Coordinates of all heavy atoms in Angstrom, one line a residue:
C14 N 1.1 4.9 -8.3 CA 0.2 3.9 -8.9 C -0.4 4.5 -10.2 O -1.6 4.6 -10.4 CB -0.9 3.4 -8.0 SG -1.4 1.7 -8.4
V15 N 0.6 4.8 -11.2 CA 0.2 5.2 -12.5 C 0.5 4.1 -13.5 O 1.7 3.6 -13.5 CB 1.0 6.5 -12.9 CG1 1.1 6.6 -14.4 CG2 0.2 7.7 -12.4
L16 N -0.4 3.6 -14.3 CA -0.2 2.5 -15.1 C -1.2 2.5 -16.3 O -2.2 3.2 -16.3 CB -0.4 1.2 -14.3 CG -1.7 0.9 -13.8 CD1 -2.4 -0.2 -14.6 CD2 -1.6 0.5 -12.3
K17 N -0.8 1.8 -17.3 CA -1.7 1.5 -18.5 C -1.6 0.1 -18.9 O -0.5 -0.6 -18.8 CB -1.3 2.4 -19.7 CG -1.4 3.9 -19.5 CD -0.2 4.6 -19.0 CE -0.5 6.0 -18.6 NZ 0.5 6.5 -17.6
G18 N -2.8 -0.5 -19.2 CA -2.8 -1.9 -19.7 C -3.7 -2.8 -18.8 O -4.8 -2.4 -18.5
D19 N -3.2 -4.0 -18.5 CA -4.0 -4.9 -17.7 C -3.1 -5.4 -16.6 O -2.0 -4.9 -16.3 CB -4.6 -6.0 -18.6 CG -3.5 -7.0 -18.9 OD1 -3.3 -8.0 -18.2 OD2 -2.9 -6.9 -20.0
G20 N -3.6 -6.4 -15.8 CA -2.9 -7.0 -14.7 C -3.5 -6.5 -13.4 O -3.6 -5.2 -13.2
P21 N -3.8 -7.4 -12.5 CA -4.3 -6.9 -11.2 C -3.3 -6.1 -10.4 O -2.1 -6.5 -10.3 CB -4.7 -8.2 -10.5 CG -3.8 -9.2 -11.1 CD -3.6 -8.8 -12.5
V22 N -3.7 -5.1 -9.7 CA -2.9 -4.2 -8.9 C -3.5 -4.3 -7.5 O -4.7 -4.0 -7.3 CB -2.8 -2.8 -9.4 CG1 -1.8 -2.0 -8.5 CG2 -2.4 -2.8 -10.8
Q23 N -2.7 -4.7 -6.5 CA -3.2 -4.9 -5.1 C -2.2 -4.3 -4.1 O -1.0 -4.3 -4.3 CB -3.4 -6.3 -4.8 CG -2.4 -7.3 -5.5 CD -3.0 -8.6 -5.8 OE1 -4.2 -8.8 -5.8 NE2 -2.1 -9.6 -6.1
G24 N -2.7 -3.6 -3.1 CA -1.9 -3.1 -2.0 C -1.2 -1.8 -2.4 O 0.1 -1.8 -2.5
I25 N -1.9 -0.8 -2.6 CA -1.4 0.6 -2.9 C -1.6 1.4 -1.7 O -2.8 1.7 -1.3 CB -2.1 1.2 -4.1 CG1 -2.2 0.2 -5.2 CG2 -1.3 2.4 -4.6 CD1 -3.6 -0.3 -5.5
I26 N -0.5 1.8 -1.0 CA -0.6 2.6 0.2 C 0.2 3.9 0.2 O 1.4 3.8 -0.2 CB -0.2 1.7 1.5 CG1 -1.2 0.6 1.6 CG2 -0.2 2.6 2.7 CD1 -1.2 -0.1 3.0
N27 N -0.4 5.0 0.5 CA 0.3 6.3 0.5 C 0.2 6.9 1.9 O -0.9 7.1 2.4 CB -0.4 7.3 -0.5 CG 0.2 8.7 -0.5 OD1 1.4 8.9 -0.6 ND2 -0.7 9.6 -0.3
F28 N 1.3 7.1 2.5 CA 1.4 7.7 3.9 C 2.1 9.0 3.8 O 3.2 9.1 3.4 CB 2.1 6.7 4.9 CG 1.1 5.8 5.6 CD1 1.0 4.5 5.4 CD2 0.4 6.4 6.7 CE1 0.2 3.7 6.1 CE2 -0.5 5.6 7.4 CZ -0.6 4.2 7.1
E29 N 1.5 10.0 4.4 CA 2.0 11.4 4.5 C 1.7 11.9 5.8 O 0.6 12.3 6.1 CB 1.5 12.3 3.4 CG 1.9 13.8 3.5 CD 1.5 14.6 2.4 OE1 1.0 14.0 1.3 OE2 1.6 15.9 2.5
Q30 N 2.7 12.0 6.7 CA 2.5 12.4 8.1 C 3.4 13.6 8.4 O 4.5 13.7 8.0 CB 2.9 11.2 9.1 CG 1.8 10.2 9.2 CD 2.4 8.8 9.6 OE1 3.5 8.7 10.1 NE2 1.6 7.8 9.3
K31 N 2.8 14.5 9.1 CA 3.5 15.7 9.6 C 3.4 15.7 11.2 O 2.4 16.0 11.7 CB 2.9 17.0 9.1 CG 3.4 17.4 7.7 CD 3.1 18.8 7.4 CE 3.6 19.7 8.5 NZ 5.0 19.6 8.9
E32 N 4.6 15.4 11.8 CA 4.7 15.3 13.2 C 3.7 14.2 13.7 O 2.8 14.5 14.5 CB 4.5 16.6 13.9 CG 5.4 17.7 13.5 CD 4.8 18.9 12.8 OE1 4.1 18.7 11.8 OE2 4.8 20.0 13.4
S33 N 3.9 13.0 13.3 CA 3.0 11.9 13.5 C 2.9 11.6 15.0 O 1.9 11.7 15.7 CB 3.3 10.7 12.7 OG 4.5 10.1 13.2
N34 N 4.0 11.1 15.6 CA 4.1 10.7 17.0 C 3.1 9.7 17.3 O 2.3 9.8 18.3 CB 4.1 11.9 17.9 CG 5.4 12.6 18.1 OD1 5.8 13.6 17.4 ND2 6.2 12.1 19.1
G35 N 3.1 8.6 16.6 CA 2.1 7.5 16.8 C 2.5 6.2 16.1 O 3.4 6.2 15.2
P36 N 1.9 5.1 16.5 CA 2.2 3.8 15.8 C 1.3 3.5 14.6 O 0.2 3.8 14.6 CB 1.9 2.8 16.9 CG 0.9 3.5 17.8 CD 1.0 5.0 17.6
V37 N 2.0 2.9 13.6 CA 1.3 2.5 12.4 C 1.7 1.1 12.1 O 2.8 0.7 12.2 CB 1.7 3.5 11.2 CG1 3.2 3.6 11.0 CG2 1.1 2.9 9.9
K38 N 0.7 0.3 11.7 CA 0.8 -1.1 11.5 C 0.1 -1.5 10.2 O -1.1 -1.4 10.1 CB 0.2 -1.9 12.7 CG 0.1 -3.4 12.4 CD 1.5 -4.1 12.4 CE 1.4 -5.6 12.6 NZ 0.8 -6.0 13.8
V39 N 0.9 -2.0 9.2 CA 0.4 -2.5 8.0 C 0.7 -4.0 7.9 O 1.9 -4.4 8.2 CB 0.9 -1.7 6.7 CG1 2.3 -1.9 6.6 CG2 0.2 -2.3 5.5
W40 N -0.2 -4.8 7.5 CA -0.2 -6.3 7.6 C -1.3 -6.9 6.8 O -2.3 -6.3 6.5 CB -0.2 -6.7 9.1 CG 0.3 -8.1 9.4 CD1 1.3 -8.7 8.8 CD2 -0.1 -8.9 10.5 NE1 1.5 -10.0 9.3 CE2 0.6 -10.1 10.4 CE3 -1.1 -8.8 11.5 CZ2 0.5 -11.2 11.3 CZ3 -1.3 -9.9 12.4 CH2 -0.5 -11.0 12.3
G41 N -1.0 -8.2 6.4 CA -1.8 -8.9 5.5 C -1.0 -9.6 4.4 O 0.1 -9.1 4.1
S42 N -1.5 -10.7 3.9 CA -0.8 -11.5 2.9 C -1.4 -11.4 1.5 O -2.6 -11.3 1.4 CB -0.7 -13.0 3.3 OG 0.2 -13.2 4.4
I43 N -0.6 -11.4 0.5 CA -1.0 -11.2 -0.9 C -0.6 -12.4 -1.7 O 0.6 -12.9 -1.5 CB -0.4 -9.9 -1.5 CG1 -0.5 -8.7 -0.5 CG2 -1.2 -9.5 -2.7 CD1 0.1 -7.4 -1.0
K44 N -1.4 -12.8 -2.6 CA -1.2 -13.9 -3.5 C -1.5 -13.5 -4.9 O -2.7 -13.0 -5.1 CB -1.9 -15.2 -3.1 CG -1.8 -16.3 -4.1 CD -3.1 -16.6 -4.8 CE -3.1 -18.0 -5.4 NZ -3.2 -19.1 -4.4
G45 N -0.6 -13.6 -5.9 CA -0.9 -13.3 -7.2 C -0.5 -14.3 -8.2 O 0.5 -15.1 -8.0
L46 N -1.2 -14.4 -9.3 CA -0.9 -15.4 -10.3 C -1.4 -14.9 -11.7 O -2.4 -14.3 -11.8 CB -1.6 -16.8 -10.0 CG -1.8 -17.9 -11.0 CD1 -2.0 -19.2 -10.3 CD2 -3.1 -17.7 -11.9
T47 N -0.6 -15.2 -12.7 CA -0.9 -14.9 -14.1 C -0.7 -16.1 -14.9 O 0.4 -16.7 -14.8 CB -0.1 -13.7 -14.6 OG1 -0.3 -13.6 -16.0 CG2 1.3 -13.8 -14.2

């Protein structure tokens, strides 16, 4: 998420797991308009 200028930015997710052994759930709805 490197940027210059304008415009809305939504939903930035960074996952870094080392031997996770587990459940992960990402969910939700996004609406954008310009």
Side-chain angles (χ1 to χ4, degrees):
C14 208
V15 155
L16 64 106
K17 294 93 192 155
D19 76 87
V22 187
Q23 33 210 17
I25 316 112
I26 297 198
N27 175 56
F28 264 108
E29 171 176 350
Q30 281 150 23
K31 277 202 45 60
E32 302 117 297
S33 69
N34 273 96
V37 54
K38 171 71 164 299
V39 67
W40 199 36
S42 289
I43 319 181
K44 173 248 200 73
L46 164 155
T47 167

